[PDB]
Symmetry: D4
Subunit: 132 residues, 8 copies
């Protein structure tokens, strides 16, 4: 029904678009919410941090839309994809039927190095992993 | 053949009913036993505790029946779903061919926070997980 | 300040013995069941009465108890939620379980999983 | 020589207290976010300013800091990458986290996963 | 091709027979070697121990044959099913394309309590788990 | 009171040496195989004779043994079932294994999995 | 699309060839890069070590080609298959859509004893395991 | 008697320092690669020469070495196979690795997985 699409740098990637196009093909009614892990924690030096994160999320949304994908909403979340997912699910329980986790390729992906692809299963939702 | 349906608060949920209706569609002979994790351990202040748990189980059974699901029996078990399953399987070995674990959505579910969905596999029975 | 997680074992000499060896103590009593069809305000009330009774039992052994709190009936969820409520308030957890062969909490591997929060865990076997 | 992993807790008395109990210290500040669409040179610059600010905070507590480095915003990736950059330079890691209930790093089990590198890990809870 | 069928008490069970009959249906050429975990380690009191184990293995073979299953050979192995598998694979590398692990029901099974069903995967062969 | 888990190593000097360093001892002898087609009363009987023989071997080394019990041939199941039978009776487990390279119990990771019950585990390598 | 085929001693095996022939049948365009774990670390006694490893890789390539398999390239990597994969993925991110891990049979395989078949999943690529 | 697992770090002062703090030592040198297409007798020979060279390096630091053995190039397989060959001969393992950031063995989590055999493991970081 509604998918939580977790992506930032891979928002412009053909592979992500292709998977979402596959999900549209099996379900024309499918809705995609882009969750952009971009918010760093508070620091000593720098609202401004959130504003910058919001800008990254909007830029991500536009990149995914330009690929022919309808995007219901883009949200900036914690810079940890695992923390971002946990916190989005807490904020909106029952909104999402699946997670689409979009990563850079092994060898380049920070999230893969952090084992996000397997740890994302602990939440209890189906996880579709896309390599971009 | 016979499914151990583990649910309490989600007994009235359309998603649970739908899955059980799917299981009926593939097997018209399917039988469902509702195991309701509701029994807290002995305390300092409060038979009465069991009686209250039995009341919750019956209420759960009625909620699931009102959804068009035939329910063979409802049992109240340990308030830990994992302990309840272990103890029901011990009490009736070979009665059940599968577990249907019904949880609240991620973000709201206590059982998901406790990793019941993956830990339930250790018993050796197939686990169908339904989010409600 | 120690987070003492106990319910049935609050009266046990082993836990008293351990706390005497050890400071302030807060008693967290996993006793609040999730909402049901027949009975939230009611079950919470009963849980807080349970917490009060456990606190009396511990104090009767000679232990001063700063506060007792009823938490989620899952010790692990109770601890998580107490740490969230009062961050930085505890320097350690004292987990009091029944002995193996009787402990539900041991069967739920509360003793090992309690370490994930980041605090030192002292495990006492009582009764 | 100790690899001190801290950012927000660089000013915390608990970390100072721990380093006083303990030698040379290098401060590794997980603060560099991955490249984005709007802002790499820019975010790195901001991260290095963040690292400098954390170093001042620690030195202000009475701790001499050999060098401060901004690393990947994931403490685990930061540590891995620092060990790769300067192999053999550190005899231990000092991990300073916020308390459970506030710590993102604890939620990410940085405290347990940090042991995989092969070095002794001392965990300090601050604030 | 050739299956290592791990069973002792469940040798006479309809469910085991049924699965092996399913495997015959998809592959008429399928061959079954019954590995019977029955050999205890050396003790203080009691060749005789092995002889007793061999007797149990033969009894198991006859029980499975009486169910209409062709059995190429029965072997008695270490009383630990995990050690028995490891040692049979060491003794005959490449003989087996799969393991069929037959257990008693959860609540009754020693092997399930010992997590044999998931630990058996570490060897690198496909594992079919049958509950009897 | 210690739960001493041993069978073949009951005569070993290493186990004696360890128990001398350490109290009451109960010897749990994993020796009871599950029911079979040819031989339950019979195999139990043989297992209890095995337990008695192991007890004599240990006592012959200078160790007083309160009781010896034959348990399930899986050390882990034996321990679980003994703790269930007599909850609170043991303050610790003494696990005596053959050395690595000969021990079936080590291969079955009994030494690490024994910790799940909640009791302190002392591991002795014998022979 | 492009598969990282991890094999050394099993390069001449019919089972490996058969799987790659299956992959060709579903995708005539499939490309195979043979990664040969053969490079030991620096020692006290013995460029020469690399040269010997390169010789093993070429020999492996020829063995796989003689089986009717097109091989795009053979590379010698770290003697640890896990380290070899990690390092190849780092050197060429996005080159590979899958890993084909070819092992000797359980009972004989060093890589299986080292749990390479399950540990290989941590990289984030699909793993096809072939026993030879 | 200690099983000292080292190859490149056999000359390292850190390992010497550790062995001086500690008895008999056997040096197990993971250096034997599996059979190949071009080169078994040959690669074994080269591995045993490697083992001899590592033994000289260690002895040159002031450590008496009872025997040096070339084992499987996987430290974990080498250890398993040595324990099988000579059961009961070792009371402990001394694992000498390069530092994190250079160690292949650390990347392979040899330091944590070595504990599964049942013996005490002392981990030395060298170079």
């Amino acid at each position: 029904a509604r998918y939580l699409v977790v992506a930032h740098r891979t928002a412009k990637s053909p592979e992500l678009a292709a998977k979402l196009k596959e999900l549209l093909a099996q379900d024309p009614e499918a809705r995609f919410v882009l969750l952009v892990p971009a918010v760093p924690p508070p620091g000593w030096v720098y609202n401004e941090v959130r504003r910058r994160a919001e800008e990254e999320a909007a830029a991500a949304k536009r990149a995914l839309e330009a690929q022919g994908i309808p995007v219901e909403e883009a949200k900036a979340g914690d810079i940890s994809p695992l923390l971002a997912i946990e916190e989005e699910l807490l904020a909106h329980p029952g909104a999402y039927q699946g997670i689409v986790l979009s990563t850079l390729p092994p060898g380049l992906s920070r999230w893969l190095r952090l084992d996000v692809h397997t740890q994302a299963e602990r939440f209890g939702l189906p996880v579709i992993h896309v390599i971009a």
